Design a protein around this ligand. Sequence first.
Ligand SMILES: CNC(=O)c1cc(Oc2ccc(NC(=O)Nc3ccc(Cl)c(C(F)(F)F)c3)cc2)ccn1
Ligand SMILES: CNC(=O)c1cc(Oc2ccc(NC(=O)Nc3ccc(Cl)c(C(F)(F)F)c3)cc2)ccn1
Lengths: 263, 264
Amino acid sequence: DDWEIPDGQITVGQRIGSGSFGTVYKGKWHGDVAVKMLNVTAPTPQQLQAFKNEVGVLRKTRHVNILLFMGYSTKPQLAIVTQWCEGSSLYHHLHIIETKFEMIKLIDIARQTAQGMDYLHAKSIIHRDLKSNNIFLHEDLTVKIGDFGLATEKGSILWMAPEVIRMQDKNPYSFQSDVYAFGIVLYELMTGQLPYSNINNRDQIIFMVGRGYLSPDLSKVRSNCPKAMKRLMAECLKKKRDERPLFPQILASIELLARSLPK
Amino acid sequence: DDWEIPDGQITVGQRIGSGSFGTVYKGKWHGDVAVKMLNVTAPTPQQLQAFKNEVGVLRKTRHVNILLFMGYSTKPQLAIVTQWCEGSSLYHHLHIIETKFEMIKLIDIARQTAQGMDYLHAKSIIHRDLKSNNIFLHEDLTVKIGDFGLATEKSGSILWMAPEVIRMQDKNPYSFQSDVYAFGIVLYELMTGQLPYSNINNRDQIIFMVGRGYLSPDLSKVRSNCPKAMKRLMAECLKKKRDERPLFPQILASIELLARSLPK
Ligand SMILES: CNC(=O)c1cc(Oc2ccc(NC(=O)Nc3ccc(Cl)c(C(F)(F)F)c3)cc2)ccn1
Ligand SMILES: CNC(=O)c1cc(Oc2ccc(NC(=O)Nc3ccc(Cl)c(C(F)(F)F)c3)cc2)ccn1
């Protein structure tokens, strides 16, 4: 009862993207599927250890808001097959084609991003890289979370929590760490913009956010953004680690201050 | 890994349905989820063996057209938690509220029902009970397959039952082919929007005639525009002889092909 797919099965289709550590190929296997090819020339030792994780950690998840894992493949290049998702990433929606989401929808995109994340931590899985770019809106409804990146190892700083920018310890990452990100994703949803937008200089934003001199200008949340939300938003972006809430509490908040809206 | 969910987590919500061997409770666990409660008074020996199957067989599947398995629960009653699906079952759509599906859609609902089934057999999992009632159209798009029944001691409905099964051979009548025949009826449903043997008002008979080969779905009901390429396949499946029906790898390919050719 394992999940290795014998080679010569997954009909590697066309290309989707490719970078530093990977290539995604929209393929075929009992249905449309995304196949992430890792190696090429040959498989590397450090590399191989990576694969054994993005998998062991994927197969441990099984929830409707997290990118489904179909199986892996040692054969012709290490390969991870995950359901193909039609549509585009949150980041694309908000900052590229600038779609205008009705408010209710926004609150729910968050709601789901919350459930997903709340599940990932239950299984004791720290994402280490949540961001609007990893929030995929499947079929334009239903948030699918995954690490759709390819220039990492396991970068992008806007969703990076202060402690992480500083790196004081060895393991800056933690459940809290992830929330801060969710905090920025939330801030995104409600203002429809990225943070530090006026500062045109990567090095600086990195430094100020690290020293506590910089923080998202919460005075941009939409006119109608629930006061109950903006509250929580700030509750997460808290610069102090242990002052941010876990997700069981986050989810409940959003959900509550949700049933009181459609009218 | 292990998918047992410690008790006191899945917030058992309201009721959804209940029968002979089960009760479904729309609950809560990191999100809306369906929880199938098996026992009550206490867990039975014959019962317990059942649970160990509907699970061992569920966790073995992992595909977008098959009802997602979230986890199980030995605690307060044996319980199987699967993603909740909003919407309704195919059977409901076609024969209860009688929605009128554009044709293209119908061909695709089948397309997916095909992919799902094609995956289930790959993992060497015979469904033993496919029917429009187990084909759930999630969010009104995306077929989710599962055994949404509760009056049959799992891992009562003859219309989708293939001849050999009605008769019963040696010990085990069920097989990949067996499942196709069902898919054949689900297809026949999709294209005529009706159930088979509709004019015969007598369960015992239908059972008998379908068994002896005297009865068969009246393929002359497929909609005016039903692709000739389809009706063909439909009949290809409903074949009364077992070994004359096609496996699913071939079925899927057929539908898919005779699909891309009709939009422009
Ligand atoms: C526009 N292109 C698309 O259409 C499209 C592309 C796809 O390509 C992909 C294929 C595979 C993946 N691999 C990850 O997701 N892996 C992951 C790593 C760590 C961790 Cl921690 C997790 C986590 F958090 F989920 F568990 C997940 C991502 C995207 C899929 C569906 N659609
Ligand atoms: C209207 N109510 C709903 O909204 C709703 C209800 C639900 O209730 C359910 C809860 C649990 C199940 N148990 C099965 O599914 N077990 C199964 C057995 C063998 C085999 Cl072979 C398979 C197979 F094929 F899928 F793998 C699946 C079915 C339905 C779920 C989502 N939504």
